[model samples]
Target: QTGGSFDQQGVFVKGYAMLGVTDEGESGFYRTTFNCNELPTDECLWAWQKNQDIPQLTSISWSPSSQRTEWVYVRLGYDITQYNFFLDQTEGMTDAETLRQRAEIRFLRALHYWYFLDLFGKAPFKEHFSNDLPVEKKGTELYTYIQNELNEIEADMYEPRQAPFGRADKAANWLLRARLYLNAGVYTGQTDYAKAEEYASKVIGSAYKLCTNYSELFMADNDENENAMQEIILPIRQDGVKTRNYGGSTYLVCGTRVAGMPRMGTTNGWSCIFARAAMVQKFFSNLEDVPMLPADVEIPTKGLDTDEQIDAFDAEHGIRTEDMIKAAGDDRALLYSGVGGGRRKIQTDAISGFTDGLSIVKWQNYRSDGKPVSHATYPDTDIPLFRLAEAYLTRAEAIFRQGGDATGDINELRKRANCTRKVQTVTEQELIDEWAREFYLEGRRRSDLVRFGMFTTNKYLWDWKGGAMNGTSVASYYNKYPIPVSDINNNRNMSQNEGYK
Candidate 1:
């Protein structure tokens, strides 16, 4: 259950386990959702890294069956089909109130359909809240149905910041539109860089502005940071007291920490997951192998493990945490270098170790003023589901795709991160790298990889990519996840995506 201080129990709960969300919080969920699925060498990544890993994936990748395909589809189906019933059941409601509810329902339904289209090409559709069988909508049909729904609700949607901070307002609507159009080329086979740019521009034109410091926006106190306005357009609310869960940002804040690790608070970390070198390399390519300056640690080779070596070195050298982070040079420097000695490296031979990969302390439970969370165990940090900066980045990419100067827009993020150098002109590939630098480990990497043609091919490689230590090209079918087996078995009307069959 959630707080009554806020309304819409259903809307608030949806964020915990939805696209761009639950995957970001699920510790290892990002490795698959552009999220990790298990501990280091994440099950999702490990499986994508092979049949061996995916066996665990298809079996219970979403953990409880409720978080999987049927769960999302049915709950979302209820959303797409049932809001009219919800609206009708309300007695003596003001016309204004009823209209607002209608807009909200449409936004939620379109948002759900957007994910459905993204993960599965064409899916069954129903409206007025359907409980029975729905004829599937395929290709451009399903894609545009979601697209048009978002557009239709746009005028009625509240303006940016018009509703309370957490509610879905016009900014959320535009954000979803921007995302929908970014993939327009992939979805309906028609690229619409112009439209993507327009909506992203609309968001940029709104009350939101860059939060100045990127890391601060994700901290526990992010909600109260006045200087951090315009950064988070819509946040998945996580409060230790009001929004307690073993999921959402609670999972993100605790799960990222490991024992004997330097993290946001005194809370012991779960240490179950870490990022691939590819993720760390996004921050500072050289840092992954950056030698420990005597200032960094003792750099001892023996007796200590990799983590211990770094710890002993740090203690001996009197290297403060901030001083070490300063050595990173880039604004987005957020990895926990090992306690043993060197930068944490994932070993090709083994991956489950806490020391194998860089522990991402990018997100935290502590506040901007550096205080403990309201609850020690649970997190109070809100997850940034959509933010204005993304709109800036989206426009930059779409414009760049159409052959324009994206240097300024992309640098907006660079400036926010306090990048040591600013980009004047950039290549298309460099633009994509900028995204990884800005949004890595969020639930966006997989999509970005696909757009850049890296997901299904061996042209670009990551640690254990395609399950090889060196990484390889996976079957193209993997470009799309298989529709869950349960959905296929139960729904006579549904057919699996092509490659799976």
Candidate 2:
């Protein structure tokens, strides 16, 4: 009288296995989200040498599923529908335990739907695996489904920090609900800042606090580091040995570094990604405080020839990575330049090479303890998908929209980062900038811009946005990625999103 014949517990755990991987010859889930959001948005850029199609995303000229959006769509549904089979077979567990496990699975599926709702503005809905095609759900309908799913599962979820590190708990469920409510205006044309504030407060009051050292949260040992783990409400686990993927943290750690920079706990530096100039401005307001050497100092035009030469030049000029961090006066500022012969530039008229903009060493493979990682090439960094800090920000924005004072929440995060320019008042512009400063390169930048009415609008522009050298307003339809054309052709029930062929 075990539940279904399969090990239900093991099957349940394995549900989370593909959250971070991409198979050979496949773009996969994590990479597509990482590339589309980070590259196309204002904060970061990707180089052509790694994936030529990535730049298409940046220019807003991508075809349906150009960054493999369909793959993620299909995969999420594939995982979600499997739970139907699990519900039927009773493992050696009581009804209450089975209900709780089912609740966890349901919560995870809602997370998938949130991605669907956020990215494509619509998704194919299926309650369980079946031969029939999924009915298309969009706008308020899809939004309501995910909202109800989270609330229904909450009673069965573990308490904050009570679940395993990477799994959903009460806090994670609440945070996701807070996020959905925060964006309710865009999804349903009905503003719900009150609900957003309510759910955000629920998580903020839970057993989680901001990690004092911001940079350590992205370090290799964050999963084990007490200071970092306390702040990470839910993480996407990445281990150099146990879970190896070409994407996830491995791409993040390797893709962001170039050959001439300081070691980032990895021997393989792909030099494929870097920050956009606007990202630098997030920390250094007008870009005035960005460190530069004395103009009279003679430097190599072609850049430094060797690692020794680059290091020596940086020492001579006082613009090493540490110096940059010191000059910015924010622990979260982990950008770099003045290394590898100083080819790095703070502003690029055109992103033609790896050194076109400032290098981001934020997602490093190096553990905080200075110990070796499982593999020198891959990373052990665990990405905090939902952290306590976001709750504070979400609540702050919610309060701001509701015409309430949010300076207290805003000041809390700034105080943690030791920010020299703390805010007495929070403006719309200030809230958005704070969002970028705290969450850049973690993915989902494009969504924030869309919610703020900045994406695809002239209100905000960044270098190379909408394929313009200095940024241009794209068609508003770009806010939602087109439902993959393949799905349209294959599933009679599926229809295309607006503003695509």
Candidate 3:
């Protein structure tokens, strides 16, 4: 408690930490978003709840009372209310430092509300702490409020990368604005490609740059590595010892890893998560023809092998992970299918066990510089909640939507990944796929799919989507989750989202 009296800076630190700590962190906000956004799409599957029915987000079977959905919504509102209450306490402290602290507190409030905007579409609005029931701000009102809040607070925010590592900087503020603009079409009945392009270009023109190596962005020392931190505009500060949680990077690193796989820098392997076949195809376009080695072959122990080395060891390993990664020639394909003590499988007709699908090693506890992690149980890697690369994609997407050439921005990411495949002609389908390839399990897939008009439409489909083995489209209302029933029961101003009522 940095305390005797309530200092503005102290509250600022506490509010910043509130986003990713323990019971309050909501699994670092990473796991919750991942379960909602990534799992439902083609990105991955949950091994722990494989046969369960109600909590099956991957199959889109969740309801308003579903624990994960309620937890994320309620938690976000809780934080917003807390910050709103505290904002009143800042009162007349008008020194430059105090003013900056107050602005940051409002920024955090906006950040939490943004999640509410993105997920539930309408949130019970509250400006100050009180016993009074909150009123509802839906769609365009909420969207514009958040936008104006960002625009209002931009002057006080630390410029670009000038802020501390985990806190929101100017670039972070602009990135969030860019994201809001990019999704303006969904929130409002109208699109705002010009605003999206402008905000994205603002971030792109900032000091932030894309991480040279894609994998380094997820490594344990990303917070310390210049190559990784340069791209990370805002990170959820996570440490292995001082900060430990079952969610966030810990859930990401531990849940996907099982015993006998290459060292994942953690002693605890939860074996709870793995990728779907459609996710694999993002790297290896042709799944049936992907090269593989014999089941008995030894995968290189130190680092990944080249395509030639994997080809030399080829026979019939049934589309193993290493060969597909090497063959695709895309460095972002971070998956493992080499039998972890002969217990893993690349594909399965039914999702029943941990080994039924390919495992993703995207978020790791290991460091890129070959250093030791702080702990064996939790990961030291910070989640890059906002990064510079998204700016590029956002700009590219805005340009594409406006019928301008997006080839340069698209090729920028491809060149960084050393991708053998480059886009000479940018297409909508290619942009969506590129979004997946770059950010498969990063907790934004559902929003991207929704923006592309594929979330509940048959335009795009993947295994087990809408509870079908062969993906099927469902009611269009699935695009926006219902306001959890608890909030509706308690708050008179709240109304259930369409299709739920």
Candidate 4:
């Protein structure tokens, strides 16, 4: 249960085991969701299957299931490499196939390391296990190992077009490398703007394209679209039957009201984890300049007087008027507007009839039960692990930082977002705002904000705890997650992140 074990069926198994544990000769259910408000207090299992928002607590406790979805892909990458070797012996086997497989394994490893690195700034890089050494290692050392692996992988990787389905192709690797380098200043205490631009440029040159419709990017049917051809660097297949419920749709639909069953097709006993007010306000204010949202409509904000108050307000009203669109200049206003606007968007039964106003419609196969359709479980959906638009923005940011042509890159990304005004060039701050409008709520905002040094600098602008609704505060070090306490306690060589216990 601690590491790798086999069942009576004789199938070899390697990895951590979670779930119910034997205690005093009795197996008692371990509830991981003890602090989760959405779940019934009596529920036995800990369900992290809620909204797409990142979890506040980083500790890992024993439960029936560890969130193995990420691990599955990592393991599959290793498995595919073995299969590629088997296929390599056949006639007409090109080195491309073998290289692609290796590329996938390397990419997958980097991705897994990224997941760990994002949450826990450093982690063990256990690429392959050997009984020769002790079982565990320090997080910092592991971080170095993963970083070196990525470097070697980059050297051997083929072009993005050579990548196959369900694998990290060349474009994906470039994006990964860009991300790694972009945050190098934080991870390793050194700025590597040159390397960041280099990797990002490779991605920009690839065939990947950004979708015109921001909303359509998440549509379930995007797998078949041309935008997918342009934008999707790597997509996970949502084969409905084989991989139903892989998405977090149920979490999006569920809110405070547990009885809100009609809105979601099926009840998975979860509710909406609302976006913070600061984030929402930022979206609205920037949208006015960048216009990612509909020009006629304003991004929703917090603190509306009432239903009648909002309805009575209009564009004709002064900008500061109750009905007029409020301009949020800083973090405080952003947070206020975000929470207030988010509440207004909540789909009430009398309104949109959905439990929440904001629903994730990215995957077309999501059902009432918050599970994908049966056929979508396969690795078919064009997941946008990387795209040309992001690359352009990254390059632009790097160039701008290094006193280069930042405006050209910023404008191109703005054009992609359907911005009308042709700004010849923008300030560094302006470029940050543009990136936010382009990638909000796509799981990139937190990291993006952090890299730009905006997160800590702008913390006082919002009511961090109240805005989150869960009493979570925006601490400086919270930017990097703590290594799971369980990992630290069990792995002798592991070291906890700074400021974490």
Candidate 5:
């Protein structure tokens, strides 16, 4: 490891370099610069988007044939050894600079480990560089190393009571702790419900609260709105200078006119990835009293006669569109909207004129330069990584699992979502459905399904089964993502997740 002088300039450069290292892609060398805010239809975007669903693109998996040399270099660049030494030698600095530098490292380390844990369950706890350690030591040692490091960091770090507009703070760490504990069942084969409750409780007690309007939470203007302390935990920075245009606009852009106007052609509209009719029906049924639509609104026909048809129901009448389509049982109408019973409400000329009732309005926003003001215009929306509502729900799940009183927690979450009283004693399955409706498309449904043991069991609209590659139950392996093969090859001490060769 190279030793360097400790100074403000060196520290800042080192910190920036470490950030870059943590964000690098192995073989693809894809940077968020090229990836973020770009048109989703671009070939590169499609490649990354498609790979998100491929089992082989597991946390640890990456393309091996492409350029990965930069990755190795950066990994070494941010290696904990060099960082720790520099930090240790800076003992003579003023308290402010020391605190700032320390805080920076802590935050960076937290982010690095969060990514590492998400992709690879266990990772080496490296504070210093060493050449003689056995490979096996790295894999088995990683779990404890990370756990202890986080504990230490949390204890010593001085975090702000309230985070600035786009930066992460102590609240984010608390949420991360909750996530780790929530998934402890998968990591250690033992449920840590108590620990999960404790961590989640910290978030609830913190300044986070739930946003009243579920849909507004994703709107660009409300990016900094703190109403729903329940959902966003770690708000990433998106100053049009340093961290600009890093929202989920890519998922919202699609169709013909890619710029401006109400009909500016959906630029970043999302394709249906996890929306299942069964799940949507379950939510609609549960939301019976929620005043979702006017009584006069006519229920539209789905133009299909399948179980998935239920999803096309008008938010008011709860009629199944697929059922109507199937009952008609004609090819022409089925293909063209006339076969099903009534007109197709999902793909109305008013909403999306082209696609056949297959657009997702979950993350709609405006593009940078559009005419009629489309939803794909804004690209700097803040993605909530944690929120208070999730904590309450998580606590409710823990209480339910422990056979404790879950009514209070469940009711709190439901009330925030504008629902009536909790459905008296909700089963685990019921809670799962509620979570999907409340947090769908926020990048949590897939993982939530895995946690609730429903990913593979629950039949979806597209019949795209969820589980490990081997057809094993998602319940068994959903908690842990396989470590990337490149990491395993480079760090022999790193162990592949179970079932991976």
Candidate 6:
């Protein structure tokens, strides 16, 4: 007890694990694992006639039966208790530090509310730091409320750089504002690209700067990496020694594991998550045409349950793997072909976990000096909750959506990647695809799909979308994940999304 006190950094990291910002929560269930991951697996997994009655993809259904939909809600509700628990610590602690903790509580509470607003339209709104049953806010009401909460606390919180690492600051608040406003159109059915641009611009203009190489940012030692620290606005830190968790960056690095690629220092990857082919396809689609391959380039997508059309094309023509990547001219094409010597494409034929899907080399567990992480299982690579690149995406998209030009913002990122191809003209669909390629595992894909109106439609089709091989439009109700019945079973309902009750 003589060891003095914990700072805002301690409390914020505590908040992150509970809230599941990057690593901890059942968030993988709602945010990505639920639907976005299937965007790639449809082709890699299906049967001969595209009939496997697949389990993983089928469970992505929006039906109320899924306990996962409830899991997401209950897990978030659990955070309310934790947030208040921390707030209660300020009993007789009348100090500036305690006041800052109060500000942290406000910020963290708004974050949970943000999660509710983003996932389910609105939630049981918490107006005070008490154990009271709060009123339910609906529609855009939650949006207005959180924005005000964040705006009011910005003045009270520590200034940028003044806050210790892995804690809240004015920019953290701004970044959330940027996201809320950027997707304002989705949450409220009313777009606010201009304000989204404003917030994102503020972040971009901050001390944060983009790394010359994107891959370097996610490697082990990223928490201390000057390159990413400049760009990463808020980090979910995981230390092999000091900070340890089963989640955080460990989940990201382990979840996307494949056989061939270097373990990025971890002993073994969990193999729970796979980098979807749909997202990878977006990166290479803009590639320049290659002449032809001299040898058979056994393609990666050549899985056991491969699509007839894809197999036929590769069989007739050469794979041309090198030319394909080079011609694409984008540096972010970080895929490995895996153990079989061919490109990695998980066999969707029957839940194939045998190295068919592309191996993601991002988010390693080693240091820049090539040393292994603190622990094999508990990773050291801090999850990048936010970074400068997103601001660029928001800034560029806000311009294009409002019918303005964004070549400067778009080209800055492209040039940074040493992209061989330069896109001078940007369209609606093109910008959406860029967001997909840029922010793949950073937790915004589902929102991007929803914002662009592609989540539940035939507009975009990956391998297992809509439970079909070629992809189909899922139920419109799927646009918003349902409120779990577990919560509803308690006879307490703040109302819920349609078709659930």
Compare candidates 5 and 6 on lDDT and give the better one: 6
Better of 4 and 5 by lDDT: 5
**lDDT value, residue 311 of candidate 2:** 70
Whole-structure CA lDDT of model 5: 0.44
lDDT of candidate 3 over 1-501, digit per residue (tens): 223475656667878877667554444455666677877888888876633332357777677777778877777787887788668777676788877877788888888777888888988899988889989999999999999998998999999889878888888888899999999999997999989999999999999998999999998999999999999998888899987768778888888887666666788888888888888888877876545335566655533344333333332464455465667788888877654523455566777877887788888888999988889789998988887889989999999999899999989998998898899999998899899889888889999999999988899888778878778898888888888888888987999888875
For all candidates, the clash counts are 34, 8, 0, 48, 49, 13
- Which candidate model has the greater lDDT, 2 or 3? 2
Which residues of candidate 6, in runs, are more than 4 Å off?
1-13, 16-60, 88-94, 129-131, 286-327, 340-343, 346-351
Evaluate all candidate structures by whole-model CA lDDT and list the values in order.
0.63, 0.82, 0.81, 0.43, 0.44, 0.64
lDDT of 5 by residue, 14-70 (tens): 553433223223211113211211111001112123434232322113333212322
What does candidate 2 score on TM? 0.94
RMSD per model, one decimal: 5.4, 2.6, 3.8, 10.7, 9.8, 6.3
Please provide, for model 2 over 469-491, each residue's C-alpha lDDT reduced to its tens digit, 9 standing for 90 to 100.
Answer: 78888888888888877788888
Cα error, residue 202 of model 4, in Å, equals 1.2
In model 3, the worst 10-residue window by lDDT is 306-315
Which run of 10 residues does model 6 get worst, by summed lDDT?
Answer: 42-51
Per-residue lDDT of 15 in model 6: 70
Which candidate has the top score in lDDT?
2
- On the 0 to 100 scale, the lDDT of residue 11 in model 3 is 66
The candidate that wins on TM-score is 2
After superposition of all CA atoms, the RMSD between model 6 and the true structure is: 6.3
Tell me the spans in candidate 3 whose CA falls farther than 4 Å from its real position: 1-4, 23-28, 50-55, 291-323, 341-343
